[PDB]
Amino acid sequence: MKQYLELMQKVLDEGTQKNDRTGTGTLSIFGHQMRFNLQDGFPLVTTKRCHLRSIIHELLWFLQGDTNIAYLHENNVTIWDEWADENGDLGPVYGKQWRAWPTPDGRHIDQITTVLNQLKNDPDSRRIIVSAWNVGELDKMALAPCHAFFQFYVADGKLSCQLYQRSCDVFLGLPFNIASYALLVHMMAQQCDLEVGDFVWTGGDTHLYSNHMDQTHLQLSREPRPLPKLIIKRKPESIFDYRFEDFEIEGYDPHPGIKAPVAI
Template sequence: MTKFDEQYRDLVFRAIVDGERVVDRTGVGTRKLFGETMRFNLQEEFPAPTLKKLFFESAKKEMFWIYQDQSNDVRLLREKYGVKVWDEWEQKDGTIGHAYGYIIEKHKQIDKLIQGLKENPHGRRHIISLWDIEELPYMSLQPCAFQTIWSVNRGKLNCQLVQRSGDLGLGVPFNTAQYAILVHMVAQCAGLEVGELLHTITDAHVYDNHVEPLKEMLFRPIMRDVKPQLHITNRTQNFYDFLPNDIRLLGYDSHPQIKLEVAV
């Protein structure tokens, strides 16, 4: 099984069996764990689940919308990329408010990150934060995966993704994949190799209505021969020159999709 499956299956199992039962913001109810971290060596394989299908294209395109388009416009996400993951949070003006891409653009964060990694690779202040306190009241959903901390070691770019709230059924595999892609792109732009991705989740939870479908996933047979690899065909070092079709997931296979309802 993939390194992602090993860690993800353990997280889901422990949340279902040992997680604290709480009533959450959505009213659906969750079983939650505190302070969990998954760790991946991106040179070995791309972190993708085989126990259930990863919608790689949607994850990739939403990441482009946030970090390259630096947009909060849900209509752009739908019309340019055909992705509808933000439809439930779309406001009357067609946006998600002052969230995600809006904050990246406001503070020029991706540009500052790449420049900083080039000029001072061993600096300890390479951080992107989407948690802009002044803007929080103007967001339709405050960011879950809200911070990345970047560090260079022996010429390899490492990244810690910090997620305050992680929906293990739907959001977490999606977010891990997105930020693994981002590490590959930023590393190429900064002239570095990829290193490790740490995915830290403060509140890692399974929604009550996801428990039975995820139990099915836990007992699926392991796909032992799958070892996904990310391939970038465009060797540009300009972050804004990448196109979604330049980034491909090779050697990936999985069991079928598990249908889960989004808690809004």
């Protein structure tokens, strides 16, 4: 995509060399923002083939409140294997925080449902937020949330969403992250009878790993194809009732895939 490819070029143009947790090395910039008008098409990267099956399943898994990779495994998704323990557990990550953030007084807050109720009864609210950044539970998580905070907004009957990603692996992570959230916005809009607005992405430490340089330049030499279209074939009773089969992506003609190593 145009915005995505411009971000890569920017990282290469004004990024600083930084050492990191993984010990790989990164080219990095701090602070960036880009907007995607969902009415223009589904933002799935076309300059390289993306695996939508894994994106959809991870999202349904998040919405279930699940943090064990069993579900992902029976659906042949292995993107989370490197961080899970002997029992397949990842700790109180995304899924748990979204559906059951623990309060100090013994309660548990379902942020997804509260957001659904806000979009319906108080769409003008400036507090329609979901956070995965639970300071008091970070030590129990296999990995600290990258996409850790997001806010919804309604205007002219359209639903918008802004995500704050503290750490961003521009080559591997980002294409997955954008499609993941664009899909959630579509599901939320269908449940609240709203049209799709903009998906605004904001990043903290936006980086490109040292071992992804050749792949990055290979992708940059490609011209983006027209954005695919998302067709939802059903309207479930709840946001938690979607199935993989309810989604149809048409007009997706990408450039060949480019393989790259993940930094654990």
